[PDB]
Amino acid sequence: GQTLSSAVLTASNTIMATLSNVTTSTDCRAAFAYFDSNNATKAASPFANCTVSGTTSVTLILASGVSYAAGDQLNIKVNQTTLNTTAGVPFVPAAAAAAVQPVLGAATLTTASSLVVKLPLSSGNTMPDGYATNMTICGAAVQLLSAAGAVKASPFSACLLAADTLTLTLTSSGTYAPGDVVNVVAGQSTLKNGATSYTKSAAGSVIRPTLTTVSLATTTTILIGASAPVSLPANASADVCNSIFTVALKSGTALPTALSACMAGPAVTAITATFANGTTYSDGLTVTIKANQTLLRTGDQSASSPLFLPPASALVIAPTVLSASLTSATSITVQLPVSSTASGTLDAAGC
Numbered sequence: 001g002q003t004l005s006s007a008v009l010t011a012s013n014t015i016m017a018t019l020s021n022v023t024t025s026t027d028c029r030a031a032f033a034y035f036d037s038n039n040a041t042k043a044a045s046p047f048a049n050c051t052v053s054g055t056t057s058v059t060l061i062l063a064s065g066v067s068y069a070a071g072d073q074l075n076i077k078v079n080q081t082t083l084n085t086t087a088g089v090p091f092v093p094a095a096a097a098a099a100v101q102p103v104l105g106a107a108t109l110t111t112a113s114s115l116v117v118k119l120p121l122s123s124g125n126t127m128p129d130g131y132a133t134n135m136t137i138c139g140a141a142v143q144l145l146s147a148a149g150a151v152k153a154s155p156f157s158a159c160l161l162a163a164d165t166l167t168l169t170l171t172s173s174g175t176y177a178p179g180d181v182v183n184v185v186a187g188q189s190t191l192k193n194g195a196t197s198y199t200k201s202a203a204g205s206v207i208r209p210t211l212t213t214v215s216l217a218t219t220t221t222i223l224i225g226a227s228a229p230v231s232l233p234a235n236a237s238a239d240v241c242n243s244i245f246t247v248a249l250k251s252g253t254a255l256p257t258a259l260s261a262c263m264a265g266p267a268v269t270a271i272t273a274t275f276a277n278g279t280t281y282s283d284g285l286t287v288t289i290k291a292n293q294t295l296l297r298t299g300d301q302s303a304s305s306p307l308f309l310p311p312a313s314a315l316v317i318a319p320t321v322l323s324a325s326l327t328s329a330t331s332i333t334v335q336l337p338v339s340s341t342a343s344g345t346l347d348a349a350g351c
Contacts, residue, residue: 250284
């Protein structure tokens with residue numbers, strides 16, 4: 001609390017400070033002042049609330065009407081008595097104000113070979129020209145690390161950036177794995193944040209798989225395709241299954257009970273559960289993981305492994321056909337589940 005540097009800026013309205021000594025402080029709100037590198041003053045009381053957020057960290061949530069700027073600086077204010085080290089020393093104003101610097105936003109693996117990452121700040125992000133085709137440019141922005149910390153040898157191929165969104169596409173050789181993490185490398189000169197740059201974060205972001213497609217496995221069951229190897233509780237109970245996949249009628253009314261049992265699929269990245277849509281049983285059914293899901297995990301059922309994030313919106317259970325049977329020497333008849341429609345001419349070329 002006399003001279004320190006670091007911090008993690010996670011969103012457009014929240015900061016956190018990293019310090020040397022552990023603390024049990026309850027309040028920090030009125031213990032900081034805001035300037036910039038240009039020396040134009042900012043929020044006198046930048047923060048509305050504080051709580052302990054780590055071994056030594058103090059979270060500092062910005063109040064309304066405040067947005068980040070390059071080289072933002074935060075310094076301890078006068079006569080602050082709530083924040084203290086466990087040694088009994090309250091913070092005093094520092095000779096050099098700490099610099100607020102960013103850290104990447106959330107991440108999710110929408111497709112088995114695409115990684116999408118949001119960013120803490122939605123403007124100013126720029127990179128050296130050639131990032132769209134140079135692995136020396138895109139690949140130097142973020143490091144991909146196993147659970148043990150073994151960085152991967154350029155599993156990426158390209159980077160795509162626009163406003164607050166960023167995207168890194170894997171490769172066939174660089175096949176994805178469960179339980180991996182992504183974090184920035186120290187001093188990387190590629191990714192900027194306006195008139196600033198991005199610096200490695202405290203813990204990184206653990207990648208989570210998700211859902212991609214759904215269909216009818218049998219006449220009364222449904223297959224579910226996943227972007228990573230799946231795992232479910234052994235011989236799970238019906239209640240467990242009903243607490244994961246929220247299932248809604250065509251217009252959006254919920255279905256309290258849809259599944260009787262849930263278990264793995266033909267492949268390690270597939271699942272099969274009871275009931276079906278086929279536009280029977282609802283005529284429009286859709287599936288989606290619940291917001292606060294608990295039990296659908298990848299790699300294993302361990303607590304550390306990532307969860308399956310819910311998709312962007314509910315997936316539509318994709319229908320199939322029932323059977324075909326020869327009747328005459330010039331005709332086959334095919335049963336289709338419940339009514340259907342035709343969108344065009346049924347000429348020989350069309351069929």
